Design a protein around this nucleic acid. Structure first.
Ligand SMILES: *[C][C]([O])[C]O[C][C][C][N]C(=O)C1=[C]C(C2=C3[C]=[C]C(=O)[C]C3=OC3=C2[C]=[C]C(=O)[C]3)=C(C([O])=O)[C]=[C]1
Ligand SMILES: *[C][C]([O])[C]O[C][C][C][N]C(=O)C1=[C]C(C2=C3[C]=[C]C(=O)[C]C3=OC3=C2[C]=[C]C(=O)[C]3)=C(C([O])=O)[C]=[C]1
Ligand SMILES: *[C][C]([O])[C]O[C][C][C][N]C(=O)C1=[C]C(C2=C3[C]=[C]C(=O)[C]C3=OC3=C2[C]=[C]C(=O)[C]3)=C(C([O])=O)[C]=[C]1
Ligand SMILES: *[C][C]([O])[C]O[C][C][C][N]C(=O)C1=[C]C(C2=C3[C]=[C]C(=O)[C]C3=OC3=C2[C]=[C]C(=O)[C]3)=C(C([O])=O)[C]=[C]1
Lengths: 433, 28, 433, 28, 433, 28, 433, 28
RNA sequence: UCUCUC
RNA sequence: UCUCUC
RNA sequence: UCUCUC
RNA sequence: UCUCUC
RNA sequence: UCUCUC
RNA sequence: UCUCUC
RNA sequence: UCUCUC
RNA sequence: UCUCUC
RNA sequence: UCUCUC
RNA sequence: UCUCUC
């Protein structure tokens, strides 16, 4: 590092203040919903609260709902399931809040500031949970992409309203999906790329293709994506080139940011415990999330005949965005063997409406890791016919044995300054296999 | 049967980044 | 799924608005033709109305007819048989409408919009009916294809003016037929693939071959079709390769979209009953068609010595595009055993002009199914000499016992959210055998 | 006598997708 | 409007006095050439007179001719064909006038004043006639420009000696042609843009590029032209940018002034009839030209096997500069369908020397319009890589259906104050197609 | 064959200003 | 045309003054070489004189020869064979002139001006003669190009020192040859495109590729050439693309300028006869060359057993650059059937040193044409994988029957103003076949 | 045997511009 | 298995 | 504005 | 490997 | 204010 | 080649 | 179709 | 003091 | 966004 | 200051 | 689409 330490501390202060805003907003909403400590630590209650906040600030959807009211749902109220424990058993109740009220509470929590960064953080946490839980092979096959490249679908469920953080965290496969959807839309109707809407669509196409270009690593991919962007009315050839680019990302990996976006319950508990994230600072890639997870208790609803350990592992991988990570390193860091998706005896965290909340129980989630490591936004050792041939040569030269991140290991929770790394010595390796 | 074929390295840890080479290169 | 829910709801709204347009157009045309409720629910009247709409918007045929007027038929009027019930007995009358009038009615129904999507929907319904009713083995033998691959003839009767929906729903056999017709046309006259028309013909050949490539599943077929496309003036070798590709599609099945395109009478009845497809939404592959069919009464003309149950089964398979589907699953879903084509005591739905409309009677069609299932655009478990040998090895490795769609079953009409599937336990299996 | 030889799976239902293997493979 | 009415009346008085000067000059020259009323109203005689006036005042050409005398043509005499009717048949005679005499007559007509504005008016009338008659695709291809952008060639034949009026009326394509000619001249000889002549050439380049910048509408084009101007020794890149700018002017139209410059015969007839343009005023864009054309008879020579209606339509479009205008609005305003150039059975108005003036006849021109409208200097609804991408986005967003000049219609000849507009309701649309 | 492709609006009249969009945008 | 007449007359005056300079230089050199009228009209003497002038002004070759003197040839003297007639028989003598003397004579002829335009004119005449005489299939095969595209080799022998005129007249095949030579040179030595010489070579590559881009007609070729230019260190793929571009130029013809550059003997005879090209003007594409050829007598040396008619036809096609022109139109214009190269019983015009100048005789050349026509710089009716497929579609759509230059015919020598064209009615059609 | 296959139109005269289509298109 | 789509 | 399972 | 995102 | 690993 | 500077 | 331009 | 729609 | 003020 | 249609 | 404005 260098004199950029001051810049590195201002960013820490800003992210700490956003975490403080999230936590104290959760505290205020828990007080306004009359939830006890146990219910306030429920992951489903936190998910519902977060979804209500995100729905309250959705400008486009709210405007459309206002202009086209839904069936029996007024466009000025939000809500979701609230799980409250009475006489030992759980019970769900649908709550309804004015969206102006939710926006006012959120603004008051952040000292009268909009703070869209906090909303983006909550959305990224939701996207990480969805990526760690569900496979969207249906959207892959519908768009023509191979369902085998599910490892490139990082941040696929993120809405467009996410800012630069959403673009940074979303993977190459999702960018290819968005571009291919635009290609198909232009193929269906030729009035696309033409007129006043043509300008806006071309601008959006330009911008998404530019940031996909910035996402790649090697020069050949970075030039083929530029060739794809240059075509004014792209057709099947550009779609095929994008397919090839996505396929090449499995070996020539692209740089995708990974951040530890925790559920709002953890931040609320930390703020209630007296932690000042504004003073101490925060970092989504450092020890700060791992340390916070170590000292926090979070409860979750367990469906009948389900394993709490599997659900805790799922929630942990969602928290650390380790859905597509190598299983060996995930198990090494966590200290408990991480079971692939096929052998997880658990369904999604969110509980459907058509469920009987009388055979359901709550289990404490073990969000503890034996070691901690720094999350990276980098790929690995990545060292129109001409570009395709060059890329095929590069992929053929690569092997699944080259060692990447040489000299970088895993640290202990006591090693806050990352002084002494532990290089692992190395079973299954794919989660979604 | 389809499934995950590559690995995306979220953690900065000395690794080998596995991928299923015969199936990926079979497409060309 | 993921944050693509909003995209999945916009598509639902758009298809609902197209269904609303179709239904209210049918209502308006019933009012302009002075048909009672019973006549308005007749399937033959709906077929005639739909054909008049499709003929009114046929640009190329109308232009040719205008430039080359037919014998006694002015090129500015459409029409068809209208069956009206008087004093108990049926009676047919040929009606004649100005094509400008029909286009104006259609545009007024869709709020001044052309809405070619609705016309494509009507054409796909007609194509499904034709596929479920008649075998075009004559066109198969005329083009040199084996009449045994009638299962790949999905969407063969679709006109070229159908957009991307027509290309998605039409089968691999029809694509091979179109390509082979182009090959034969180029073989007959060598001035093909040359000149100004040569450019257009090469462009069309490119596009049809590209979407046939996208239709296939395995890489070897996808590469052989690319090899076929590359030849500048294809001859007998390319035709033989296309024949082999079509033959390989019987074991290595291609991905063909299946949609439930209902007759316009059902949509008109739903719109008259007050259903708002724009608000509630629609989906051609979900429960929406099955639910709509359950609550709708449709009548049809029965020729003397014909079984209403067989005609109802034919109309049901036409509605759900189950012409080439396995008979066991069709009978399981419907709840009534589905009889193959050879043992159906019924002729086509459309009544010829040289028929006596005094021995004909009307029977209510039983368009009810015990269960409902999601229609799929996928194949099964599909897991130049070199490509041919590889494909032959793949087909030889496959057996007619491999279980596909593992874990996916059939739902009850009460299960609107598809929560609990019912995997069937398994007689004849081919309709056209 | 000719006839249908394969099955096209319109419904997404757990099935076995029958086809007449001896007659299809007899062509090669 | 506002207190600028006085300014708007002074301009009217000045243009009226220039029209009076033109008319009384034509009267004096008719008296000095001994032409009867019929010959004085001939359009060819007026063209010859106007050309003699313009040649008399051409300073540079006269100086060059004086220093380099031509072959058998002394540089102090002008002239042209004079068509006189004797014993029923027409006959041409070449007349010769001293240029000092013509200049003296012109100055005496304008009360001892040079009045270069009148000469510019005559030149603009000639340029409008040439634009409405002939296509200069040869100059387009010679300079490398696409011959498809003939709609931007307004005022291409105008000589450089035309003042600000010539620059205002000439189109974007002609400016691009002049700039490209300068670019080519500098590419051929590198001593261009260098020395004493380099200063003058750079000044001229600056000025023409500045007024081309002022001609455009949107900011992106206005910035790209500024980028083009900044290069000190422009090369092929600037020429390509100018080509792109001209191509973008077909969708993002530039503001080109349109004025009704009538032939001198009409002004002479009006002055003979007693009209005082000085007192009543005049306006090249208002009703004044349309009203004057309604009350004036003008005759023209018709070649054997030619249609007088087509020649009258050509002369009308030349008078109102409607050469590149939409055919539908031109036909609506005129009241008679306006036939495109390809189907006009007429050659140019000017009669060549190698023609037999014994099979030629004279026909009265129907310069009458059913309605009248205000000519506009505006474009439509127009609402280095970055600039090019922005312009391409703007053009792609635009459609050939956006309604421009909303609420502005066409007036009747009785409606002198333009109180009640008539918005037309809308066949071919391109003259030079 | 070449020809006029755009329209230059000399008259100030409510119009739509036609132009041949596929041919103009084909250059890019 | 339009007000660009003045510009069209200044160019005529400038080319007339260059023709006058050439002619009076030839007169002065004939006086300084003591040649009679018959010897002065010999085409071989004119060729020798022209070659001496071109060699005198060759800066680079003269500098290299000065720094590296040749074997027995001092680098400050030029010369060539001079054929003088004595006592009836011909005799050759090698003449030697100081190059400073030749440069001084040339400058004095052009009024103390360098006038490189005249030298370019002489070089273009030599190149046209070489193209009409010899086939460079050896240079085609050496560079890898197909020897079948000899029709694109227009202006292949032109030296690089020719200005914009040389680039305009040279064909697409020669540009592809130059680019391919550069590609091969860079492939051989990778230090190419790198360093101080790398800058110059890249600049030259840029410029030649840009003007090749300007030479093409359709947009697809114009975009593929741009794609070729963009590669920083082009290799085999760019060479293959250039080969494909050259092959596509046989159907999608490129715009190549054609000028009638006559031998200096004709200009000298015209200047001696009193013609003032400065006053009357000149044009290399109009009637001026055809008229001049009609009134001029030129003699040439005939080898034993050779046909004077064939040599005259060869010289005529060289003069009018009709080497690659359709034989039918050439025969129609000339009035005498034009025999292809294979059946011409004549060798090259230039006489080798190892020839016996005692069996050689002189024959008058019949440089007379029955009609005359305007030479055109245009192609015909021309109405990275994607670009290649589009171009292949365009070429396949084209046929060898489409009529180009519709409505444009051939004029008679009396029709100086091209008033009445004669469209020909249509045997062999290829000269080099 | 090789030879000229196309025509380059030096003169601006109504023509058909012959070329040997089977041999040119045989390369693709 | 071509009852018509050369 | 036609019609026909193979 | 498309159980729905035309 | 919905839901679902493939 | 991003072991932290959104 | 490379009778010379590596 | 010329002329030409493409 | 020039329906008139060159 | 050379020469050669393929 | 350059029937002449190098
Ligand atoms: C954290 C950090 O590092 C990050 O970095 C990277 C990122 C950057 N940023 C970016 O790129 C951005 C983007 C965006 C977008 C856009 C824009 C514009 C338009 O038009 C369109 C678009 O789209 C999109 C985006 C994002 C995402 C997605 O997905 C899509 C932005 C906004 O939007 O704003 C920003 C930034
Ligand atoms: C629903 C969805 O998913 C669908 O997807 C798939 C599809 C896509 N699309 C496509 O592909 C298309 C196609 C087409 C076509 C064409 C084009 C062009 C040309 O040239 C030709 C052609 O052909 C055809 C088609 C279709 C169908 C058929 O059959 C044939 C289109 C049009 O046409 O437009 C569109 C799209
Ligand atoms: C009517 C009114 O409105 C008008 O306005 C607009 C216009 C303004 N003006 C102007 O711009 C002008 C221009 C000119 C010119 C010039 C100048 C200088 C120099 O150097 C050069 C030039 O050039 C030119 C011109 C014009 C035209 C053309 O074309 C070219 C002027 C003069 O010249 O003077 C004036 C003004
Ligand atoms: C007559 C007229 O029209 C013509 O036009 C067209 C042409 C234009 N121009 C041009 O382009 C030019 C070119 C050149 C060149 C160059 C330059 C520079 C560099 O670096 C190189 C080069 O190369 C070349 C050329 C030419 C030819 C050849 O071959 C090669 C020039 C010079 O050089 O200077 C000028 C102009």
């Amino acid at each position: 590092t260098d004199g950029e330490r001051q810049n590195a501390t201002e960013i820490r202060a800003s992210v700490g203040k956003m975490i403080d805003g999230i936590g104290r907003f959760y505290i205020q909403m828990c007080t306004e919903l009359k939830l006890s400590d146990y219910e306030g630590r429920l992951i489903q209650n936190s998910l519902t609260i977060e979804r209500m906040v995100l729905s309250a600030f959705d400008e486009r959807r709210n405007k459309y709902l206002e202009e086209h009211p839904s069936a029996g749902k007024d466009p000025k109220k939000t809500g979701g399931p609230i799980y409250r424990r009475v006489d030992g058993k759980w019970r769900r109740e649908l709550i309804l809040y004015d969206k102006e009220e939710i926006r006012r509470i959120w603004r008051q929590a952040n000292n009268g500031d909009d703070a869209t960064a906090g909303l983006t953080h909550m959305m990224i946490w939701h996207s990480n949970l969805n990526d760690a839980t569900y496979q969207r092979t249906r959207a892959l096959v519908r768009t023509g992409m191979d369902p085998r490249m599910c490892s490139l679908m990082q941040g696929s469920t993120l809405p467009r309203r996410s800012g630069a953080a959403g673009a940074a965290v979303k993977g190459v496969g999702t960018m290819v999906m968005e571009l291919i959807r635009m290609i198909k839309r232009g193929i269906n109707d030729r009035n696309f790329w033409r007129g006043e809407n043509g300008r806006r669509t071309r601008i959006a196409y330009e911008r998404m293709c530019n940031i996909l270009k910035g996402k790649f690593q090697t020069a050949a991919q970075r030039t083929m994506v530029d060739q794809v962007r240059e075509s004014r009315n792209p057709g099947n050839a550009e779609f095929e080139d994008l397919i090839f680019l996505a396929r090449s990302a499995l070996i020539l990996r692209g740089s995708v940011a990974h951040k530890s976006c925790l559920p709002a319950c953890v931040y609320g508990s930390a703020v209630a415990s007296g932690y000042d994230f504004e003073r101490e600072g925060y970092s989504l890639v450092g020890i700060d999330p791992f340390r916070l997870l170590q000292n926090s208790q979070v409860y979750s609803l367990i469906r009948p005949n389900e394993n709490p350990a599997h659900k805790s592992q799922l929630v942990w991988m969602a928290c650390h965005s380790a859905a597509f990570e190598d299983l060996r390193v995930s198990s090494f860091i966590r200290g408990t063997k991480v079971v692939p998706r096929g052998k997880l005896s658990t369904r999604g965290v969110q509980i459907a409406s058509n469920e009987n909340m009388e055979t359901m129980e709550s289990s404490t989630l073990e969000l503890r890791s034996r070691y901690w490591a720094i999350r990276t936004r980098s790929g690995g050792n990545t060292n129109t016919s001409d570009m395709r041939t060059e890329i095929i040569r590069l992929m053929e030269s690569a092997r699944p044995e080259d060692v990447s991140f040489q000299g970088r290991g895993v640290f202990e929770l006591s090693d806050e300054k990352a002084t002494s790394p532990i290089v692992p010595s190395f079973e299954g390796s794919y989660f979604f296999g | 049967s389809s499934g995950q074929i590559s690995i995306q390295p979220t953690f900065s840890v000395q690794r080998n980044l596995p991928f299923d080479r015969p199936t990926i290169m079979a497409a060309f």
